[PDB]
Design a protein around this ligand. Structure first.
Ligand code: HEM
Ligand code: HEM
Ligand code: HEM
Ligand code: HEM
Ligand code: HEM
Ligand SMILES: COc1c(O)c(C)c(C/C=C(\C)CC/C=C(\C)CC/C=C(/C)CC/C=C(\C)CC/C=C(\C)CCC=C(C)C)c(O)c1OC
Ligand SMILES: COc1c(O)c(C)c(C/C=C(\C)CC/C=C(\C)CC/C=C(/C)CC/C=C(\C)CC/C=C(\C)CCC=C(C)C)c(O)c1OC
Ligand SMILES: C/C=C(C)/C=C/C=C/C(OC)[C@@H](C)[C@H](OC)[C@@H](C)CCc1oc2c(O)c(OC)cc(OC)c2c(=O)c1C
Ligand SMILES: C/C=C(C)/C=C/C=C/C(OC)[C@@H](C)[C@H](OC)[C@@H](C)CCc1oc2c(O)c(OC)cc(OC)c2c(=O)c1C
Lengths: 385, 245, 55, 125, 93, 385, 93
């Protein structure tokens, strides 16, 4: 047989990237996964080269990043690629997830694929938080403070967890040095989880926009989707380039150009944009414990969709009510984020509490009810007895 | 939130460095340094800017050397271990007015004048904000506003009450290049200088972006064409069904 | 097009020619861009400011 | 949701002429908006097949219907990838949009339900 | 080798689809086809179709949420102006 | 089938660790590989926990390690585990390699297995050097200096490589910060190479002490070799424990408890013990370029053994001349190391040059000649015409 | 599935060995066997065998190298003592 098949290492490459049978009809929404692998590579490469110049001591961390910006040849390019790339990593992840939601990709037999995806998402959120703390600007210090304090809500042994996470009385040198060490580690665990993600993908193959079997018409990955991937790889790079060179600070927060100050929390504190919907959800609950429980539950409830989707067909392409409510969900999610960016003030507090309800009601109530109704509508529209 | 607590929205001035193809104006940077030296430096440090970065930007190698040597820095101890000082060199960072935080608060009614190395990036509004703040002190506060003793009013500062008085007045500086040193001219200049302090890579960054965006644009348009070609057999493929007997 | 069939003659362009063309491109393109850029910003550059100072 | 259950609810609606005259027009309009007929599909072509009931059912389909389903599915993928719909004269008509796989599915669900019942029967003395 | 769980996809020659008979396909080399100056004239009134079907599913939820956002914002603005400080005292705590 | 077989993740575990068919007769020499995986885990876990407390700045690095020793709870245990574990990692690697040499494990069809092994060995040597530099004691500074200078021997562009590796005029802050960043990275590349090593192992299985086929009598990995591995895992831990608690500095160098000094190279400078044979080889050549070429060649010549072993049977078990010369090789290697620990003085310089010759002559001359002779001896001792 | 290179090991049921016929094996449960106080009396004069065959292959190369080491060392010691400083001047450069 061909060497690409017979060799032990190359056959892996062949079965995943060259001869892998793809459904002929997958559209550009199926390009997001390769863009996520690319993102993971950009973050790791730029982070390692920056690590070469970075000091994690709480006295030196902010200045060591200014040193990367000012003194390291092309240092500002590395830092701006890393920071803007993290944002682009989330944009593309949301689209990858939204794609999965729309086309019923979470369904059997791809439940394991979906569950591993949810783990990667949690890990990616934790990784970006650890990195954000390493700058040690004002947003870094108070981000580290607020988020480590999430665990203080744990019954009896919560404040013990927090002081253990801090390595002392407050967010200090121990804290920032261990958060750098952890920020370096977790990207490699994400890489191992991506391999597990691709393993589960390989045994059943991709789904497609029709939601039905792809077995009757496959075309090889190589050529067709290699070069189709290339189209969105360049478009992705173009847009990332426009930010990195022309607008490098538009997606960040001006307060993180101020060194962290343990005695002063700025009035202008706002979470990173990709954390805003979740922040809003927590802020909507006027109780400490229940605030952090509900926020975590907003991530875990993604695990419930294979069971509450009662439909008998995969995906929303031929489903009028499901399409409509899907876009209610998406724009509700954007609202949650716009609420997160706002002050805790009259109209906003209520809107956030209602949007929070809509968020959970989608998975637990709307999808099971609507998919049942659509099941029955499909039936009585064709059966004549 | 109330408009006073938010602060007045700074308007958009036509900065000559705004726009994708635009470098800083380096004459304005040169002037802005003078305004910093003669007005601002009395209260504001500039800790992250080293003398050498001025060379080839706003001043000559010779000019910067003279400027640095006007300051004394700690040197290595002599053969016997007693401390000793030294004129400044190009490797040194621009020195600040105060020795520590406590001495800076003492000289300013208890307030701390921030370092200005990053101030343009560390505020919403950027150049527009800094400029507007410096030129936006009214002679009298709006009616009803009771200002704390030692505070000043400025509508662009959040809450209106700022601990820095107006410091720019017409012709308090003699511009080395002849330019009329009006307050709005001086504001325009320091602000341009402070944007450079915060973003020294500005001119070069945009030049690299121009190349990067042209190459990537072309690669994008090219890959579309190559994809369509590689897919043409599949896209125009035709099926016929003849049901089997 | 018959401009292609004179140089490469119905064959694809080979890596060696591609690599060689890339080294040429890099230098030519950089000079073309720096030239346009410095010209577009005439007056504002340090080059231009130094012409009005002497000491 | 099982097809036995969809059939239960659906038949109840279809018989009672209160609901039958109220719902079927809604359902008819839902089916046209769905759009699958413009791709040359019948609804039963759309049922997710990656489970034992549907594999039993498809196994039991007569040859000629099987080859026809195969063509309709392949033709749907090709049209989808060209971002077109079929010529209107090629669309599936409502008379053709029959539940051809439904009887095989219902039969397999009943067989499966009985096995589950018999594997778990209690005994009383 | 080491065994294997049964799946719903195989590989070339045993993909796991049903037996195909009667379908005949035809295609033509990309090399023999018109260089890409075709689309347009034949295909631009064609597409821009698939979003006539869709735009309502996107636009109506978008509209609902944009209206709801604009309204709540303009209300917050009123509340913190002079005119609204009386209503502010009422709705606050 | 059983779930351990049918599940996508567990089946990997099953085929590598549970049902994997082992030749019944492999002896305790085949336990070294699991001990190497264990070593890799010990190094990574203890390194990450130490990284949490470590500062890579050249002003702070030595004190930050003293801080781990003095202030971090159980910090001395982590550091001594890491340092002594690195040594134990080499002891076991040499034994794993020597096992391979003796039993003809490098032979067809396991050539790829052997070649990947040689890459891991190079990577492991580079990783330990990077770690040793992070202490920034006297041996750290001059080790970094001498070893980065290896590349200055490269024609024309050599001093350019060195100044690029240094990040300046000499071994300084840039150097130690990038060496820490690199020390963190390479263990994960070694982990990926170990997976590639186990992949090549899996398609042909282990060899055995008889050198013949194992296909006629296999027993499962699980139970038999899982619990047999456990025996040497505990013995390994016992001995490592005796060093870590009772003799933690016996395998290191006292000069690395002195902060690095750019102006003074101690007269007592000696390489780490596991680098001594290679050091001796370099020192034996009175030329700069040829010294570093010959030393690198002493590692690459391992790649030549599948071709120069002319024998018709795998392994040395039934080979009288090959057994004898194998032990000449081993004890010659120990001598090379004892020479490395000695002064460049009269008897030693010549002994080192002769031992160097014997080292290369083994692969290039002795093995091809002797294995040919043994081939012929086996023949004429049984054929009667 | 995806194809596969032919190797020299298969798996349980198709290991790739030759066809076996005529060989019959017997074994007895570990549970039914004497608790481990057996070895000794029957097996300690037994082992300590496999190193009667081997010790010469190890010992003779070891001997050669230990002798060679001891000799070179004692010579270096002589060279750097008073008695040997004359020979040192001779053999050095
Ligand atoms: C010289 C023209 C000059 C500049 C430029 C300048 C700028 C400046 C900024 C941008 C701030 C930060 C305001 C903010 O938080 O948004 C700031 C703050 C203070 N300054 Fe200043 N400043 C200039 C000059 C002077 C001079 C000469 C003095 C000392 C007499 C002075 C003092 C201060 C103080 C005090 C503050 C703190 C404001 C507060 O916290 O309320 N500045 N300045
Ligand atoms: C999935 C991968 C990663 C993500 C999502 C990520 C994200 C981030 C984020 C959000 C920041 C702060 C950006 C800012 O400056 O505002 C950051 C900082 C940093 N990261 Fe990462 N990171 C990743 C991987 C890595 C890796 C493997 C390293 C290697 C050491 C690394 C090293 C650093 C360093 C040195 C900083 C501080 C410099 C800076 O602020 O940009 N990162 N990271
Ligand atoms: C670093 C993160 C990730 C990487 C590199 C990655 C990569 C991939 C790749 C290459 C594909 C195939 C192509 C595609 O459909 O886009 C895929 C499919 C899929 N992924 Fe991910 N993924 C990531 C995160 C996630 C997350 C966060 C989820 C969901 C919570 C997820 C859910 C899925 C699903 C369900 C599919 C199958 C889609 C289908 O075929 O219909 N992935 N992923
Ligand atoms: C194959 C893996 C590894 C090997 C062979 C190895 C070896 C070494 C060596 C020889 C030293 C110097 C020991 C001494 O103090 O004398 C060292 C130091 C160090 N290593 Fe590693 N290392 C490995 C992995 C790691 C990893 C993944 C990290 C994670 C950051 C790490 C972090 C450190 C730190 C913080 C030091 C300085 C503390 C110390 O001196 O012990 N190492 N390593
Ligand atoms: C971190 C390093 C390594 C790991 C974790 C590792 C692990 C393993 C494992 C688990 C085995 C099977 C059990 C055994 O035979 O001991 C194996 C076999 C083998 N390894 Fe390694 N290995 C490492 C380094 C190397 C090196 C440095 C070489 C040679 C330069 C090498 C050569 C071999 C060979 C030839 C075999 C097959 C032996 C036979 O079956 O006769 N390995 N290794
Ligand atoms: C069936 O469905 C599929 C499908 O299977 C595939 C594969 C693709 C195509 C997409 C991909 C193959 C994505 C693949 C990418 C990954 C799995 C990446 C994993 C992540 C990593 C971070 C890689 C590891 C990287 C490193 C350790 C970095 C290396 C570091 C270096 C070189 C440092 C250098 C610096 C110095 C100083 C020495 C599809 O598109 C698809 O559907 C259409
Ligand atoms: C056919 O031959 C074989 C054979 O195949 C096998 C498998 C074995 C048995 C041996 C093994 C299975 C060895 C296996 C081990 C590995 C491949 C290990 C790979 C290396 C790693 C470093 C693992 C990855 C680890 C990490 C990323 C570390 C995790 C870090 C953590 C938890 C940090 C925690 C700390 C905080 C603060 C959160 C044999 O013995 C054998 O012959 C007899
Ligand atoms: C060693 C690792 C540790 C201890 C922690 C990892 C795990 C934690 C998380 O998920 C993995 C966590 C990031 C969480 O996930 C629920 C995110 C949605 C966080 C959302 C979040 O962000 C904020 C933020 O960014 C801020 O910045 C200025 C400030 C903030 O207050 C004002 C917040 C905040 O109030 C919340 C809820
Ligand atoms: C970014 C990574 C970089 C630049 C370098 C990695 C690659 C280099 C190596 O192999 C991978 C390298 C370690 C080499 O391998 C041939 C070893 C056998 C080194 C042998 C070695 O050690 C010494 C040592 O330890 C010392 O300490 C005090 C001092 C030394 O002089 C006195 C030496 C020395 O003279 C030699 C040859």
């Amino acid at each position: 047989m061909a060497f690409r098949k017979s060799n032990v290492y190359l056959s892996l490459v062949n079965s995943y990237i060259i001869d892998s049978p793809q459904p002929s009809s997958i559209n550009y929404w199926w390009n997001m996964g390769s863009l996520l692998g690319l993102c993971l590579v950009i973050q790791i490469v730029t982070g390692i080269f920056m690590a070469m110049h970075y000091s994690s001591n709480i006295e030196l961390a902010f200045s060591s990043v200014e040193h990367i910006m000012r003194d390291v040849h092309n240092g500002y390019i590395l830092r701006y690629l890393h920071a803007n790339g993290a944002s682009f990593f989330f944009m593309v992840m949301f689209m990858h997830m939204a794609k999965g939601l729309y086309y019923g990709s979470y369904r059997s037999p791809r439940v394991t694929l979906w569950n591993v995806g949810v783990i990667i998402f949690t890990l990616t959120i934790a990784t970006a938080f650890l990195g954000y703390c390493c700058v040690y600007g004002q947003m870094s210090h108070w981000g580290a403070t607020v988020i480590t304090n999430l665990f203080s809500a744990i019954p009896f042994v919560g404040n013990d967890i927090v002081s253990w996470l801090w390595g002392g009385f407050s967010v200090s040198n121990p804290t920032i040095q261990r958060f750098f060490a952890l920020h370096y580690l977790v990207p490699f665990i994400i890489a191992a989880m991506v391999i597990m993600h691709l393993m589960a993908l390989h045994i059943h193959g991709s789904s497609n926009p029709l939601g039905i079997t792809g077995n009757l018409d496959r075309i090889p990955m190589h050529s067709y989707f290699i070069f189709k991937d290339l189209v969105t790889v360049f478009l992705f790079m173009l847009i990332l380039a426009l930010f990195v060179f022309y607008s490098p600070n538009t997606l960040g927060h001006p307060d993180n150009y101020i060194p962290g100050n343990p005695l002063v929390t700025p009035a202008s504190i706002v979470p990173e944009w990709y954390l805003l919907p979740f922040y809003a959800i927590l802020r909507s609950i006027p109780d400490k414990l229940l605030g952090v429980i509900t926020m975590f539950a907003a991530i875990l409830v993604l695990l419930v969709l294979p069971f509450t989707d009662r439909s008998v067909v995969r995906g929303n392409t031929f489903k009028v009510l499901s399409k409509f409510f899907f876009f209610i969900f998406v724009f509700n999610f954007v609202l949650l984020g716009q609420i997160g960016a706002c002050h805790v003030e009259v109209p906003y507090v209520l809107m956030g509490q209602i949007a929070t309800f809509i968020y959970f009601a989608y998975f637990l109530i709307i999808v099971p009810v609507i998919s049942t109704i659509e099941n029955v509508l499909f039936y009585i529209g064709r059966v004549n007895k | 939130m109330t408009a006073a607590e938010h602060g007045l929205h700074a308007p958009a001035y036509a900065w000559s460095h705004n726009g994708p193809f635009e470098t800083f104006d380096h004459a304005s940077i040169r002037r802005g340094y003078q305004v910093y030296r003669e007005v601002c430096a009395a209260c504001h440090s500039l800790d992250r800017v080293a003398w050498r970065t001025l060379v080839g930007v706003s001043h000559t190698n010779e000019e910067v050397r003279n400027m640095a040597e006007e300051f004394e820095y700690d040197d290595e101890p002599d053969e016997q271990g007693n401390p000793k000082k030294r004129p400044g060199k190009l490797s040194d960072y621009i020195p600040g007015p105060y020795p520590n935080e406590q001495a800076a608060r003492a000289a300013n009614q208890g307030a701390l004048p921030p370092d200005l190395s990053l101030i343009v990036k560390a505020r919403h509004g950027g150049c527009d904000y800094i400029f507007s703040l410096l030129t936006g002190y009214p002679d009298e506060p709006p009616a009803g506003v009771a200002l704390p003793p030692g505070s000043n009013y400025n509508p662009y500062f959040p809450g209106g009450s700022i601990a820095m008085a107006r410091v720019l007045f017409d012709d308090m500086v003699e511009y080395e290049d002849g330019t009329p040193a009006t307050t709005s001219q001086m504001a325009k200049d320091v602000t341009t200088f402070l944007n450079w302090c915060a973003e020294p890579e500005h001119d070069e960054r945009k030049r690299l972006g121009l190349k990067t965006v042209i190459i990537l644009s072309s690669l994008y348009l090219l890959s579309i064409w190559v994809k369509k070609f590689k897919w043409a057999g599949i896209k125009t493929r035709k099926f016929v069904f003849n049901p089997p007997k | 097009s018959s401009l292609y069939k004179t140089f490469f003659k119905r064959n694809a362009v080979f890596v060696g020619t591609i690599f060689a063309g890339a080294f040429v491109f890099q230098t030519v393109f950089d000079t073309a861009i720096t030239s346009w850029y410095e010209n577009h910003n005439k007056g504002k550059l340090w080059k231009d400011v130094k012409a009005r100072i002497a000491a | 949701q099982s097809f036995t259950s969809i059939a239960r609810i659906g038949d109840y609606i279809l018989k009672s002429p209160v609901l039958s005259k109220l719902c079927v027009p809604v359902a008819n309009q839902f089916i046209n908006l769905a759009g699958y007929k413009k791709l040359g599909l019948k609804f039963d072509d759309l049922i997710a097949e990656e489970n034992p009931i549907m594999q039993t059912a498809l196994r039991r389909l007569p040859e000629d219907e099987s080859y026809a389903r195969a063509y309709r599915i392949i033709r749907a993928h090709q049209t989808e990838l060209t971002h077109h719909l079929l010529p209107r004269n090629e669309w599936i008509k409502a008379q053709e949009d029959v539940p051809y796989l439904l009887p095989y599915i219902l039969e397999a669900e009943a067989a499966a339900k009985e096995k589950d019942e018999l594997d778990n029967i209690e005994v009383s003395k | 080798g080491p065994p294997s769980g049964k799946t719903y996809m195989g590989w070339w020659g045993h993909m796991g689809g049903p037996k195909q008979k009667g379908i005949t396909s035809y295609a033509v080399s990309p090399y023999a086809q018109k260089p890409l100056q075709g689309i347009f004239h034949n295909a631009v009134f064609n597409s821009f179709r698939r979003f006539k079907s869709q735009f309502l599913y996107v636009l109506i939820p978008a509209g609902i949420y944009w209206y709801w956002w604009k309204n709540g914002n303009e209300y917050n603005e009123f509340l913190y102006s002079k005119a609204g400080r009386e209503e502010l005292e009422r709705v606050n705590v």
